[PDB]
């Protein structure tokens, strides 16, 4: 994302099992590294590095 007129989508899951498969497997705290080469993606960016 780049905040220049960017549209993102949303989905509210409608089942308790659809919640718990989304929280345990798909959360941001459980997806910090990319599955490709194990490098972290959620980290600091410009003005947090500067």
């Amino acid at each position: 994302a780049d905040f220049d007129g960017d549209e993102m989508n949303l989905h509210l899951p409608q089942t308790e099992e659809a919640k718990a498969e989304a929280l345990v497997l798909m959360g941001t705290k459980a997806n910090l590294v990319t599955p490709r080469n194990g490098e972290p993606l959620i980290a600091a960016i410009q003005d947090f590095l500067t």
């Binding site: 089942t15 308790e16 099992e17 659809a18 919640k19 718990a20 498969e21 929280l23 345990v24 497997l25």
Partner: protein, 78 residues
Amino acid sequence: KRITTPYMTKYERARVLGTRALQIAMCAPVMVELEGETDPLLIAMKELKARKIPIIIRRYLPDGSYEDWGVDELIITD
């Protein structure tokens, strides 16, 4: 004996919390003492931390045999 892994995988953890949250969403008895919680998933995770969930995970090998592991005897982790 049982030869499969002793660590609970993320898929077992996710589906046990899901099925336990769907049971607590219906009027099932709760094995822990809740302290004001309303979301069923949070009560499921409190039951998971205290090792009280009455689910037996049956693991099917690809030949057809199985192994019945308890939730309270798999090593939980993050």
